[PDB]
Amino acid sequence: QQSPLIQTSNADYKSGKDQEKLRTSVSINLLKAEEGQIQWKVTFDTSEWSFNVKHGGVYFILPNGLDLTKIVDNNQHDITASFPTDINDYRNSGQEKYRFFSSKQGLDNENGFNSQWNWSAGQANPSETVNSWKSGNRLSKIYFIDQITDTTELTYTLTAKVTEPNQQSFPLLAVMKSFTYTNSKSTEVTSLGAREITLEKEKT
Numbered sequence: 001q002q003s004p005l006i007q008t009s010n011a012d013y014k015s016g017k018d019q020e021k022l023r024t025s026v027s028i029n030l031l032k033a034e035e036g037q038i039q040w041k042v043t044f045d046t047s048e049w050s051f052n053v054k055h056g057g058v059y060f061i062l063p064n065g066l067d068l069t070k071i072v073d074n075n076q077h078d079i080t081a082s083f084p085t086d087i088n089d090y091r092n093s094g095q096e097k098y099r100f101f102s103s104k105q106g107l108d109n110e111n112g113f114n115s116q117w118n119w120s121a122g123q124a125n126p127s128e129t130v131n132s133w134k135s136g137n138r139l140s141k142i143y144f145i146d147q148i149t150d151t152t153e154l155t156y157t158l159t160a161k162v163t164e165p166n167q168q169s170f171p172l173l174a175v176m177k178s179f180t181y182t183n184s185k186s187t188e189v190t191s192l193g194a195r196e197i198t199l200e201k202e203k204t
Contacts, residue, residue, distance in 0.1 A: 006194040025044060
Protein backbone atom coordinates (compact mmCIF):
# COMPACT_ATOMS: atom_id res chain seq x y z
CA GLN A 1 0.00 0.00 0.00
CA GLN A 2 2.99 2.40 0.09
CA SER A 3 6.15 2.42 -1.99
CA PRO A 4 9.62 2.59 -0.41
CA LEU A 5 10.45 5.88 1.28
CA ILE A 6 12.41 8.37 -0.84
CA GLN A 7 14.82 10.68 0.97
CA THR A 8 17.03 13.19 -0.86
CA SER A 9 18.78 16.40 0.17
CA ASN A 10 21.15 19.00 -1.24
CA ALA A 11 23.20 18.72 1.97
CA ASP A 12 26.83 18.11 0.99
CA TYR A 13 30.38 17.99 2.39
CA LYS A 14 29.97 21.44 3.92
CA SER A 15 27.62 19.98 6.53
CA GLY A 16 30.32 17.53 7.63
CA LYS A 17 29.16 14.66 9.85
CA ASP A 18 25.54 15.87 9.77
CA GLN A 19 25.21 15.28 6.01
CA GLU A 20 23.48 11.89 6.26
CA LYS A 21 21.20 12.95 9.15
CA LEU A 22 20.14 15.99 7.11
CA ARG A 23 19.55 13.80 4.06
CA THR A 24 17.21 11.52 6.04
CA SER A 25 15.31 14.04 8.17
CA VAL A 26 11.95 13.91 6.37
CA SER A 27 9.70 10.87 6.71
CA ILE A 28 6.21 10.06 5.39
CA ASN A 29 4.12 7.11 6.56
CA LEU A 30 0.63 5.98 5.61
CA LEU A 31 -1.75 5.80 8.56
CA LYS A 32 -5.04 4.88 6.83
CA ALA A 33 -6.28 4.56 3.30
CA GLU A 34 -9.95 3.82 3.87
CA GLU A 35 -13.26 5.15 2.53
CA GLY A 36 -12.17 7.44 -0.27
CA GLN A 37 -9.80 9.06 2.21
CA ILE A 38 -6.04 8.93 2.84
CA GLN A 39 -4.42 9.85 6.17
CA TRP A 40 -0.68 10.06 6.62
CA LYS A 41 2.02 11.14 9.04
CA VAL A 42 4.78 13.56 8.04
CA THR A 43 7.76 13.63 10.41
CA PHE A 44 10.61 16.17 10.34
CA ASP A 45 13.74 15.40 12.35
CA THR A 46 14.82 18.96 13.15
CA SER A 47 17.61 18.11 15.57
CA GLU A 48 20.50 18.93 13.19
CA TRP A 49 18.89 21.96 11.56
CA SER A 50 19.50 24.77 14.12
CA PHE A 51 16.02 26.19 13.55
CA ASN A 52 16.11 27.69 17.06
CA VAL A 53 19.05 29.81 15.85
CA LYS A 54 17.93 30.47 12.26
CA HIS A 55 14.36 29.56 11.41
CA GLY A 56 13.22 27.22 8.65
CA GLY A 57 10.04 26.19 6.86
CA VAL A 58 8.26 23.01 5.86
CA TYR A 59 6.15 22.09 2.82
CA PHE A 60 3.45 19.51 2.15
CA ILE A 61 2.90 18.78 -1.55
CA LEU A 62 -0.29 17.11 -2.62
CA PRO A 63 -1.08 15.42 -5.97
CA ASN A 64 -3.96 15.77 -8.36
CA GLY A 65 -6.84 13.59 -7.21
CA LEU A 66 -6.44 14.37 -3.48
CA ASP A 67 -7.96 17.28 -1.57
CA LEU A 68 -6.63 18.17 1.87
CA THR A 69 -9.42 18.15 4.43
CA LYS A 70 -7.40 18.33 7.65
CA ILE A 71 -3.83 18.96 8.78
CA VAL A 72 -2.86 18.73 12.46
CA ASP A 73 0.46 20.19 13.65
CA ASN A 74 2.92 18.89 16.23
CA ASN A 75 0.92 20.62 19.02
CA GLN A 76 -2.30 18.87 17.93
CA HIS A 77 -3.78 22.11 16.57
CA ASP A 78 -5.99 21.66 13.51
CA ILE A 79 -4.38 24.28 11.27
CA THR A 80 -6.37 23.41 8.13
CA ALA A 81 -8.21 26.75 8.17
CA SER A 82 -5.03 28.84 8.67
CA PHE A 83 -3.98 28.22 5.06
CA PRO A 84 -5.27 30.63 2.39
CA THR A 85 -7.35 29.16 -0.41
CA ASP A 86 -6.65 31.91 -2.98
CA ILE A 87 -2.98 32.34 -3.88
CA ASN A 88 -3.53 36.10 -4.31
CA ASP A 89 -5.23 36.62 -0.94
CA TYR A 90 -3.23 39.30 0.84
CA ARG A 91 -2.81 36.87 3.75
CA ASN A 92 -0.89 34.58 1.34
CA SER A 93 1.91 37.13 0.99
CA GLY A 94 5.65 36.54 1.34
CA GLN A 95 6.08 36.60 5.08
CA GLU A 96 2.84 35.10 6.38
CA LYS A 97 3.37 31.91 8.37
CA TYR A 98 0.88 29.77 6.42
CA ARG A 99 1.01 29.91 2.64
CA PHE A 100 -0.72 28.05 -0.17
CA PHE A 101 0.26 27.54 -3.83
CA SER A 102 -1.71 25.73 -6.54
CA SER A 103 -0.78 24.73 -10.07
CA LYS A 104 -4.31 25.63 -11.17
CA GLN A 105 -4.21 29.22 -9.87
CA GLY A 106 -0.70 30.20 -10.92
CA LEU A 107 2.62 28.76 -12.04
CA ASP A 108 5.07 31.68 -12.16
CA ASN A 109 6.35 34.51 -9.98
CA GLU A 110 6.75 34.54 -6.21
CA ASN A 111 3.48 32.78 -5.34
CA GLY A 112 3.69 30.44 -8.34
CA PHE A 113 3.46 26.68 -8.08
CA ASN A 114 6.55 26.14 -10.23
CA SER A 115 8.52 28.77 -8.33
CA GLN A 116 7.73 27.28 -4.93
CA TRP A 117 8.47 23.78 -6.23
CA ASN A 118 11.88 25.00 -7.36
CA TRP A 119 12.55 26.49 -3.92
CA SER A 120 11.49 23.32 -2.13
CA ALA A 121 11.32 19.82 -3.60
CA GLY A 122 13.27 21.05 -6.63
CA GLN A 123 16.26 21.96 -4.41
CA ALA A 124 16.49 18.73 -2.41
CA ASN A 125 18.41 16.92 -5.19
CA PRO A 126 15.17 15.05 -6.06
CA SER A 127 15.46 11.62 -7.65
CA GLU A 128 14.17 10.66 -11.08
CA THR A 129 10.94 9.34 -9.57
CA VAL A 130 10.17 12.68 -7.93
CA ASN A 131 11.14 14.68 -11.01
CA SER A 132 8.87 12.37 -13.04
CA TRP A 133 5.93 13.22 -10.79
CA LYS A 134 6.58 16.90 -11.56
CA SER A 135 7.09 16.56 -15.31
CA GLY A 136 4.01 14.37 -15.58
CA ASN A 137 1.93 17.10 -13.94
CA ARG A 138 0.87 14.69 -11.16
CA LEU A 139 1.30 17.29 -8.38
CA SER A 140 -0.87 20.33 -7.86
CA LYS A 141 -0.85 21.93 -4.39
CA ILE A 142 1.82 23.11 -1.95
CA TYR A 143 1.10 23.97 1.70
CA PHE A 144 3.90 25.93 3.40
CA ILE A 145 4.61 26.80 7.06
CA ASP A 146 7.24 29.45 7.78
CA GLN A 147 8.97 30.31 11.06
CA ILE A 148 9.84 26.77 12.14
CA THR A 149 12.04 27.04 15.24
CA ASP A 150 11.79 23.57 16.83
CA THR A 151 14.76 21.38 17.69
CA THR A 152 12.91 18.09 18.10
CA GLU A 153 10.93 15.73 15.90
CA LEU A 154 7.94 17.52 14.44
CA THR A 155 5.02 15.35 13.36
CA TYR A 156 2.03 16.48 11.30
CA THR A 157 -1.04 14.37 10.50
CA LEU A 158 -2.73 15.06 7.15
CA THR A 159 -6.07 13.77 5.88
CA ALA A 160 -7.25 14.20 2.31
CA LYS A 161 -10.31 13.22 0.29
CA VAL A 162 -9.82 11.22 -2.89
CA THR A 163 -11.49 13.35 -5.55
CA GLU A 164 -10.66 11.18 -8.61
CA PRO A 165 -12.62 7.95 -8.22
CA ASN A 166 -10.71 6.17 -11.02
CA GLN A 167 -7.24 6.81 -9.58
CA GLN A 168 -5.31 4.42 -7.35
CA SER A 169 -1.82 5.99 -7.18
CA PHE A 170 -1.13 9.08 -5.03
CA PRO A 171 2.34 10.63 -4.64
CA LEU A 172 3.01 12.22 -1.23
CA LEU A 173 5.91 14.64 -0.56
CA ALA A 174 7.16 16.83 2.23
CA VAL A 175 10.10 19.24 2.30
CA MET A 176 12.08 21.08 4.98
CA LYS A 177 14.64 23.86 4.58
CA SER A 178 16.68 26.32 6.56
CA PHE A 179 16.23 29.92 5.45
CA THR A 180 19.82 30.85 6.37
CA TYR A 181 22.24 27.93 6.30
CA THR A 182 23.43 26.86 2.83
CA ASN A 183 25.36 24.00 1.23
CA SER A 184 28.73 24.43 -0.52
CA LYS A 185 26.88 25.82 -3.57
CA SER A 186 25.33 28.57 -1.38
CA THR A 187 21.83 27.09 -1.70
CA GLU A 188 19.73 26.88 1.48
CA VAL A 189 19.99 23.34 2.88
CA THR A 190 16.84 21.48 1.82
CA SER A 191 15.59 17.92 2.40
CA LEU A 192 12.72 15.91 0.97
CA GLY A 193 10.75 12.84 1.96
CA ALA A 194 8.44 11.12 -0.52
CA ARG A 195 6.26 8.05 -0.95
CA GLU A 196 3.56 6.89 -3.36
CA ILE A 197 0.35 5.40 -1.92
CA THR A 198 -1.45 2.72 -3.95
CA LEU A 199 -5.07 1.94 -3.13
CA GLU A 200 -7.10 -0.72 -4.78
CA LYS A 201 -10.68 0.51 -4.99
CA GLU A 202 -13.40 -2.12 -4.50
CA LYS A 203 -15.82 -3.14 -7.24
CA THR A 204 -19.33 -2.95 -5.74
